[PDB]
Design a protein around this ligand. Sequence first.
Ligand SMILES: *CC(=O)N(C)c1cc(Oc2ccccc2OCCn2ccc(=O)[nH]c2=O)c(C)c2cc(C#N)ccc12
Lengths: 547, 401
Amino acid sequence: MVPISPIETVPVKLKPGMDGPKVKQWPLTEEKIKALVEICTEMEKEGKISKIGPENPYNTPVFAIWRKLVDFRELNKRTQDFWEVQLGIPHPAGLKKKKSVTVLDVGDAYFSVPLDEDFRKYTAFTIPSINNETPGIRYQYNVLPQGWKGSPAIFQSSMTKILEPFAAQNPDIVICQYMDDLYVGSDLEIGQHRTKIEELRQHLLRWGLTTPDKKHQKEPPFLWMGYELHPDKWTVQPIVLPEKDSWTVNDIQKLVGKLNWASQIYPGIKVRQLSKLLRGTKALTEVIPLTEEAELELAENREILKEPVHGVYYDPSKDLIAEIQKQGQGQWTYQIYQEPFKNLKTGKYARMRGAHTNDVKQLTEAVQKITTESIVIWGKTPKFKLPIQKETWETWWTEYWQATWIPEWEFVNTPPLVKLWYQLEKEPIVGAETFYVDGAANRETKLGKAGYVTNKGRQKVVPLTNTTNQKTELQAIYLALQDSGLEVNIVTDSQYALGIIQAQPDKSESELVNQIIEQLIKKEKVYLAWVPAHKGIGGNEQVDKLV
Amino acid sequence: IETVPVKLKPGMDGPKVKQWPLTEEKIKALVEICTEMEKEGKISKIGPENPYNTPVFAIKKKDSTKWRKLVDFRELNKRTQDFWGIPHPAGLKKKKSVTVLDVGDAYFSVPLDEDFRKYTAFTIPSINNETPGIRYQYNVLPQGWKGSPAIFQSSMTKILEPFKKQNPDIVIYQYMDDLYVGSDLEIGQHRTKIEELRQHLLRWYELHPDKWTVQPIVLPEKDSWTVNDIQKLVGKLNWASQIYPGIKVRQLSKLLRGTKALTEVIPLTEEAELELAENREILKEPVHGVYYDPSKDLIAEIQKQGQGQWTYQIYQEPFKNLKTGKYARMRGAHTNDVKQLTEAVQKITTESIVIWGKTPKFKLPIQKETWETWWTEYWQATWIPEWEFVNTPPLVKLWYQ
Ligand SMILES: *CC(=O)N(C)c1cc(Oc2ccccc2OCCn2ccc(=O)[nH]c2=O)c(C)c2cc(C#N)ccc12
């Protein structure tokens, strides 16, 4: 016999202060008992388990579905935490094309990785006796049991330590571990490739691990995690949008799931209205009617999803480009590619929940998201193509009160273009009328007043019902914008209104703020000055609006 | 040569912080660095039985092209038991010049306690999540961990004993992996003395706090005031009245009576001139009842003033500023707001280390996603402070300009 190299065992402990499992074995039928006796006899003959005496106080229930299935949920609750087997799902667009990709089944190695001997006693289980007239057969695992908390991580780490020298001495190939399968890709000639595959089978056999000589079951196209992986391209598994006379909540969640999933390769997917119908429902069986916007959006989706689209694999010798387009209603779409008309992947970005916003902030956030995703998938930031002029961005970030930055980018003339819709003056305007505005409201009756007095003697006060102080302050500014020329100075004491306007929104939840924005867009010059209230600053008339 | 027992605070488990994504060049740099460290026994590979993690990235210090490995030990530092202390040198900030030296390599000669090593685990990440990452743990005192200067403190005293006995006029302070050496000599004599100290430490950053002072509130001096000028003056005086009690604005607000054009010139009455002069005299005095409490956090606020200018205030209680300043230095960040902000944060943190011996909690005028996306690209310091984000534009910005 050729000596087999021993696999180093991982020291395993229980959670602090806890003790091993002690679960009562379920009574089994005589047939199931016989089946488990045969299976456990074979496994004991193979070395996966070993018989133990009565000194072991631990027990884990065993079932047969024959097939043996041990329920380790309690021991899993009591087992220490391990490092994750994965920190994320690989994305197909990050894979690098290979002339040959071979699949090796290392499933038989799962039972060949030994278990820490001080921990084996916690895996004890009992086969019940026929008619329960003898003591049940007591076993404990000597290898990583299927279903135990630490089996995948210990198996992956053991396999990685085994494969490390083979991967080091063969830098012209690529070895990837995924569950109980190894994937070996290379650009070598097919003969040299199969040769190095045989070398890997030998190197693995030096630890006693067996790879099947049988022709494998996996072969192009690889179906994996909702993906189709082809030798030269990738896509998502076929996305079929069902025809429904009426849509329920789970149908809309299935549809928004199919659309979100399809959006990573199909450009232009929109999910705003369909996901908007799921607002605050929390009822899985509730039937919700479709708005017309959801119907137009769904029709555009069916038009985009009518014929297959594929993405290409990553070529590190070419540049990485990401292009963004605005879709409206806080929706954005983007394509990441290295060659024109050949996308690596696509995606979308929806604006965050907020009371006020503008397009520039949303484009910025989308750029940050694409940057992070790109560093995840490819390990580098892409060059951006953005629908915004250089002078627009320069004006924005030079005048914005927050620090902001977008990485290397270039302007692409693809409407709608992101623009600045208004810009407030830095100094008071000579020759322009000066509107002193104020508003006030009663906390109990909700009655208020909003108005202005100007240097030319122009005045206005408007009474309001069902309003607040903030609403009357905004309303006062709005009135000043309504009744003034193309250039106007505006004096307010509202720290709230100044806080809103200095954030430079172009859209808002409040219709009053949106009206103020529409007024600001029409003006040529607007200077907004703030003063402290109740300080006797004449013009600023708190009494005119508190009557 | 002998390990000192170290443990965590009662009831606290080790750190489990997600590793953030890294570029390919930073990953390769970390692979080279960590391979070399593994050859030197400073770190060792670990198995899946280690669930703890602390983030790692790579930087490039000043005047150097070599990559450096930076570990974000903030969570482990707050989860590590308190070590005990030495009173902060109040004379370090009064010295004419201070020089910062990186003494982090000396920590690697002292082994780390056996049972504590598993809490220093870190992960070199893989591109596209193909592997769970290359996992390491430290065998020696790691750079950036608060226990390293506390454990090495005796050895550092033994090494610095001859130099401190030779020059009693030189102040020496230690914070994390940095050594602050303050004196009053000439720049050339200071540099030769720094080479003397570095060759002294070998066989075993110009900073001038004297050119830094606190910034008072100033009011404009004009011969003709417009309505707008007076309105801004009344606003600033009203804001300063929260800090200084006797500030009075009623005589200046008297001039704003009536609805006048913003650009209209208004002459100052005599009562208004007297009020403004009294306000100047009040502002020339220091703030009443301003003290430092070592048990409280330090809070630093930064305002972007445009044109590469930044203002900052360090305080513990509102309107009780312990330090104010204006960073306008331009160093290869003329077109990058985030790089300027990161450099300002590092400078303010350094000043706070010199003055109080701890780092402040920053309020950054930036969206969370932008900052968290880009701040590691421009970070050059060994330590990392805490920060939060302000999303509403503060009105007081122009009052610090
Ligand atoms: C190993 C792993 O983590 N994943 C996600 C994985 C990768 C696959 O592709 C692969 C393996 C080794 C080397 C190179 C590549 O892919 C390069 C691009 N490419 C893909 C497919 C192809 O036929 N030719 C190519 O050049 C594959 C194929 C997987 C398949 C399955 C399944 N079932 C799961 C995971 C992976």
